[PDB]
Each structure stands twice: as structure tokens, then as C-alpha cells.
């Protein structure tokens, strides 16, 4: 079970230095024995990021020999290092701006031209991925959201406005998870103020608006903010 543990600070301010690390588990970076499968010298420990609204961008790679390859778009800024004794390799990006806000993935690249016994599927690709570190570059301070009701008007629709929070994400449920049918929790938008905002809506029978209780549960882990907001006809 080769897996990648992603860590490092994801909340940064402009002009600061992004510094992420992935720890490899299930294999050794300092093991130079080779008796089966692919040589550990054929692994290329890599970084890939996805900014909001964009595709995957291959950042670069490092071999345990220390040889690096970098994307020319970032070659002037990026540094990738490896520490075999700690099973770690790291990504550094200085002088960050909002354009560096992205989810940053580490991954195992494989490029084998010889092998022993069997060649496992996944050669010439990034076959094992960490699950990412979300990084936000902002001067904003960590802030819990303000939750306002989207009251049903005169099938009915209602919801909650989860406004002015930082950073992402927030978890939203309805009636402590008892209500899921018809719920739409929209992806947050970055407001011009630098804070995020989303709405969560649900369509319900009009007849239930007198009897049923509707409560939206908001959990903003970075600020330890928990809000239960009741939404009722105005």
C-alpha cells in the first residue's frame, strides 16, 4: 500500500513562501536493493496543482538521485527537494500571489525501461497520488461565516446564505443530516472582499411549510464555528 501523506501550511499571505511536503509510506526512498519489479530509481516524485477553474498543471519532479525537472512556466520560481532518510520530498514556491491559490497534489511518477519478474501496471504515468493540499494565498483573516435564512416565499424553495468566511471549506447539512433529498449546496464563490460565500437550498412541499421544521447546520472547521439556523416563512 504505497500512499502519500500531504502536509504543510495551506494558508498563506501574498509574497510569502509556499512550502509543502509529502511523506512516502509503504516503500523506502533509501533502499537501493533491487530484486523484483521496478527499480526505486525509476520513481519520479512529482507535484501537480489545479487552480480554481483551470486544469491540471504539472509542476515538476525529483528523482532520489536529486535530479529535477521543472515546468518552464514555474522554473524561475520553483524548488523541489528530496530527503530519503525521512521518506520526504517537498515543494517550495516563493513570492506567492492569488494566482498560486490551488489544490497541490504530490504523485509518484514511473518511467521504467527494464524490470525484474513482472512490470506492474502504471508505467509511464503518475500512478499513485496524494489527496492534495488546498492552498489559498490571501491577506484575509480566518473568519467564521454569517448564516442568514433564505425564507420560503408566497413545491416551495428555501435555504441558508453562508456568507463571509475564510478559508474554505464549510460543511452544510439539513436537519442534522435527516434531510438530503432535493438539497443543493452550491460551490462557494470568492467575493471581491476576499471572503467566500455560498448558499444551500432545498425544495420541499408547500404543505410542509406549516408543520416541518427546517434547520441548516453549518460547520466551519478552520474557525471552529458551528451554526444551526432555522428557516421559516416570513
Amino acid at each position: 500500500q504505497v500512499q502519500l501523506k500531504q502536509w504543510g501550511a495551506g494558508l498563506l499571505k501574498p509574497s510569502e513562501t509556499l512550502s509543502l511536503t509529502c511523506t512516502v509510506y509503504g516503500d523506502s526512498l533509501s533502499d537501493y536493493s533491487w530484486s523484483w519489479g521496478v527499480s526505486r530509481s525509476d520513481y519520479y516524485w512529482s507535484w501537480i496543482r489545479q487552480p480554481p477553474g483551470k486544469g491540471l498543471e504539472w509542476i515538476g519532479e525529483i528523482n532520489r538521485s536529486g535530479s529535477t525537472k521543472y515546468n518552464p512556466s514555474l522554473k524561475s520560481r520553483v524548488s523541489i527537494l528530496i530527503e530519503a532518510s525521512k521518506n520526504q520530498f517537498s515543494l517550495k514556491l516563493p513570492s506567492v500571489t492569488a494566482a498560486d491559490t490551488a489544490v497541490y497534489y504530490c504523485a509518484r511518477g514511473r518511467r521504467s525501461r527494464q524490470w525484474i519478474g513482472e512490470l506492474p501496471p502504471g508505467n509511464y504515468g503518475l500512478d499513485v497520488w496524494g489527496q492534495g493540499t488546498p492552498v489559498s494565498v490571501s491577506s484575509a483573516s480566518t473568519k467564521g461565516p454569517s448564516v442568514f435564512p433564505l425564507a420560503p416565499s408566497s413545491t416551495a424553495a428555501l435555504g441558508c446564505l453562508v456568507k463571509d468566511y475564510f478559508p474554505e471549506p464549510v460543511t452544510v447539512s439539513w436537519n442534522s443530516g435527516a434531510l438530503t433529498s432535493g438539497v443543493h449546496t452550491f460551490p462557494a464563490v470568492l467575493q471581491s472582499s476576499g471572503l467566500y460565500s455560498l448558499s444551500s437550498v432545498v425544495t420541499v412541499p408547500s404543505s410542509s411549510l406549516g408543520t416541518q421544521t427546517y434547520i441548516c447546520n453549518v460547520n466551519h472547521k478552520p474557525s471552529n464555528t458551528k451554526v444551526d439556523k432555522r428557516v421559516e416563512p416570513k
Binding site: I48, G55, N123, Y124, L126, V201
Partner: protein, 216 residues
């Protein structure tokens, strides 16, 4: 000089059970050893599907296959399953760095046209005490994804003071939902009476307007 990949189409709309053909073109001819494909679903890391002369990666079922030679490469899904609808990337990996991805193709479910149900929400009294007014317009369960929202304030068309958010395609009925949020200060909001959300969508014969009068 480097290897540049271009994928086509940007979006592909197919029904489950159909065959999907995704294209990826390299700027120079590349050995099929170095053409890799990835699947990417929201909330997850990308996953390798095909690499090293069209060999399936671990756990990849047989309906995924690869083909192509020289500059034009193809990912084929012989019979689509509901879990196959996602974004698909090609990557050149091992021929010459940088090992860049293509732009990606969104494979979405094609269904019949569905008109949105439109709802408008005034700002709550509680938010007004904070000095800001948010007016929310909901477009619920529509297809296709393309839709136009036009805010009107006492018949004056707005521009640049609202934001949109669209959900991922619903896993049950394959529709989309969209919210448009108009943001005004408390002082500005109380200067006007009629707040209207005008929605244009191909499932609607004419634009549909939902409105309220401030204070009623």
C-alpha cells in the same frame, strides 16, 4: 519547443450505455509509450487510467481502451457507466519534459431539455442589520447547463454586481442548478422597490421573471 497537447471536444454529452471517443493531439509525433490518460472527479485526486502503449492501470475495467499513433491519440469508453462521467486528461509522460497535461474533456450525461424552476429571495431583516443586502435567485434542476440570468432593479438592468455558482450534474436526474446573488449595501438596497431576476433558458419559451417589492 516542447510537446503541447490539445484535447477535443471541450465537453462531450452522452447517455449511459453509449460509446465515448475522446481525442488528444500532440504538437509533434510521440511514441505511444508516453501517452497517458487520467480520470478526475470533483473532490478527489486524478486517477491513472491508461499508460505505456495503452495498458490499463490497476483497477481499470476493460471498457477503457487507448489507441492512436504519431500525433493523434484516442481514449475510448466502449459502454458508458454512470460512474464514468467525469473530466478526462491526457498527458505526455516520458518523451520530453515538461510532462504537461491536456486541457481536459468534461464527459457529462446527455438528457432531455429541462426548464429551471426559478425562485427569488429578498435579504433577511437580520442581514440588513449588518449593513449589507444579498438578493438570491435560484435556478433549480435544469438542462442543458447554459443559462442566462439578468438582474433588474426598478427596471434598470444590472451588470457586475452579482455572482453565479453552478452545481455539479445531479447523479439522479442529471440536471444542474444555479444561484445568482446580487449584493448591495443596505443604503442602496432601500432606495429601490422592485427586485427582479430574469432567466433565459432553452427550455423556456420566453424569459421568466421572478420579482418582489421591497418591504412586502
Amino acid at each position: 519547443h516542447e510537446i503541447v497537447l490539445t484535447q477535443s471536444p471541450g465537453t462531450l454529452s452522452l447517455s449511459p450505455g453509449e460509446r465515448a471517443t475522446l481525442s488528444c493531439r500532440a504538437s509533434q509525433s510521440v511514441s505511444s509509450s508516453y501517452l497517458a490518460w487520467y480520470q478526475h472527479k470533483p473532490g478527489q485526486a486524478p486517477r491513472l487510467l491508461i499508460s505505456d502503449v495503452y495498458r490499463r492501470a490497476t483497477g481499470i475495467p476493460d471498457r477503457f481502451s487507448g489507441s492512436g499513433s504519431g500525433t493523434d491519440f484516442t481514449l475510448t469508453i466502449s459502454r458508458l457507466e454512470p460512474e464514468d462521467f467525469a473530466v478526462y486528461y491526457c498527458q505526455q509522460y516520458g518523451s520530453s519534459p515538461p510532462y504537461t497535461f491536456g486541457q481536459g474533456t468534461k464527459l457529462e450525461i446527455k438528457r432531455t431539455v429541462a426548464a429551471p424552476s426559478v425562485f427569488i429571495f429578498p435579504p433577511s431583516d437580520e442581514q440588513l442589520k449588518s449593513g449589507t443586502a444579498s438578493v438570491v435567485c435560484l435556478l433549480n434542476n435544469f438542462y442543458p447547463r447554459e443559462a442566462k440570468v439578468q438582474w433588474k432593479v426598478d427596471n434598470a438592468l444590472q451588470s457586475g454586481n452579482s455572482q453565479e455558482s453552478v452545481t455539479e450534474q445531479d447523479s439522479k436526474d442529471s440536471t444542474y442548478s444555479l444561484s445568482s446573488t446580487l449584493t448591495l449595501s443596505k443604503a442602496d438596497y432601500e432606495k429601490h422597490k422592485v427586485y427582479a431576476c430574469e432567466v433565459t433558458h432553452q427550455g423556456l419559451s420566453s424569459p421568466v421573471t421572478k420579482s418582489f417589492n421591497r418591504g412586502e
